[PDB]
Design a protein around this nucleic acid. Structure first.
Lengths: 97, 118, 97
RNA sequence: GAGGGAGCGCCAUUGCACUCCGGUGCGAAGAACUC
C-alpha cells in the first residue's frame, strides 16, 4: 500500500481494556512524532486492530519500519499503512475502529 | 445569616461531617455544588450538606429550596473548609450530597430524624 | 552486575502517572516471560525509576538486552539488574527475613 | 456554554526500592477530557 500518515495495526491482544491499550500504544509510538489520535477497536470478542494517526507520514513510516513485528503484550504487531481514509470511517460507524 | 433557613447545633453538625467522612468507603458522595445540585434534580440525593460561609450566597442559595421541592434532607455546616476536608478533596467545598445507602442507612436515618425537630 | 530476576529501569519519563506506567511496562515486557510484579513509586527519591520482577532470571536478562535504550515515552530506558533480590523473590527462595 | 468530576503547571531531582512521605501556584466557587 502507498504511504499514509496513519498506520493500521492488528494482532493486538483482544482481552485488554481499551483506554490502557490506547495509552500503551502512546507509550511506544510517541517516540516517532506527534500523535493526533489513537483509535482502537471495540471489542474484546472480535479481533484487535487500531489506527494510530501521526501528523506527518514520515513518522508513520518510521513506526512501521521500526515497530514491525514487535511483541506488544507478547503478540507481534502486524503493522501496515492505513488505506484510503480507512481511519475516519472506522471512527464513524460507532464502535470504534 | 441568612440563606440558612434553620440553625443547627455544633455537635450535630460534627457527627454529620464525620459520618460523611465515613460514607465514601461504602457508598458514594458527590462533591461540589454542581454535582450536588445535579445529585438532587436527577432525584438521587438522600441528604445534602450546605456550607454557611460561601461567599457569593447565590452559589448555594438555590440548594435549600431545591431540597424542599422534592423533599431531600439538608444540613448546614459552618466552614466550607471543614466540609472540604470532610469529603476528602484538597480545596474548600460549598456543598456535598450522599448518594448511596451502601450500608449505614440507620445511622443517617436517625440523623435526618434529628433534622426534622427544628 | 550479577544477573537477577529483577531489572532496575531508570530514566523513565517522570510526567506519567503510576498505574499507566506499570501497565505500559507490562505491555512492553510481558514478551519475555511471567512478571511477578512491577513496583513503581514517585517519591522524590524514586521518581523515574521502576523495578520489574520477572519469575525466571533468563526473562530478566533477555529483557535487559532487548529493551536497552528503548525510547519509552520518547525516553531511552536504562536497564540494569537489581542490586538485591526483591522481597518476593527472596520469599520464593526464603532467604526472606 | 452543555456535559464531566479531580487534576493541571512550575522549580528541584538520574534517584536501588519493597510499610507512606520534596517544595510550590492554581483547582469542587469545578482540573483533565468531550461536544
Amino acid at each position: 500500500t502507498r504511504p499514509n500518515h496513519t498506520i493500521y495495526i492488528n494482532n493486538l491482544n483482544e482481552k485488554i481494556k481499551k483506554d490502557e491499550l490506547k495509552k500503551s500504544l502512546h507509550a511506544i509510538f510517541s517516540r516517532f512524532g506527534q500523535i493526533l489520535d489513537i483509535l482502537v477497536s471495540r471489542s474484546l470478542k472480535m479481533r484487535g486492530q487500531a489506527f494510530v494517526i501521526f501528523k506527518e507520514v514520515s513518522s508513520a513510516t518510521n513506526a512501521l519500519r521500526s515497530m514491525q513485528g514487535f511483541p506488544f503484550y507478547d503478540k507481534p504487531m502486524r503493522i501496515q499503512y492505513a488505506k484510503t481514509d480507512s481511519d475516519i470511517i472506522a471512527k464513524m460507524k460507532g464502535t470504534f475502529v | 445569616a441568612s440563606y440558612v433557613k434553620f440553625e443547627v447545633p455544633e455537635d450535630m453538625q460534627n457527627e454529620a461531617l464525620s459520618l460523611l467522612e465515613k460514607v465514601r468507603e461504602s457508598g458514594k458522595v458527590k462533591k461540589g455544588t454542581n454535582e450536588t445540585t445535579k445529585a438532587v434534580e436527577r432525584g438521587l440525593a438522600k441528604l445534602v450538606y450546605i456550607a454557611e460561609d460561601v461567599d457569593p450566597p447565590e452559589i448555594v442559595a438555590h440548594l435549600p429550596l431545591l431540597c424542599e421541592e422534592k423533599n431531600v434532607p439538608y444540613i448546614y455546616v459552618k466552614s466550607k473548609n471543614d466540609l472540604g476536608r470532610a469529603v476528602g478533596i484538597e480545596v474548600p467545598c460549598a456543598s456535598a450530597a450522599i448518594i448511596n445507602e451502601g450500608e449505614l442507612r440507620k445511622e443517617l436515618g436517625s440523623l435526618v430524624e434529628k433534622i426534622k425537630g427544628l
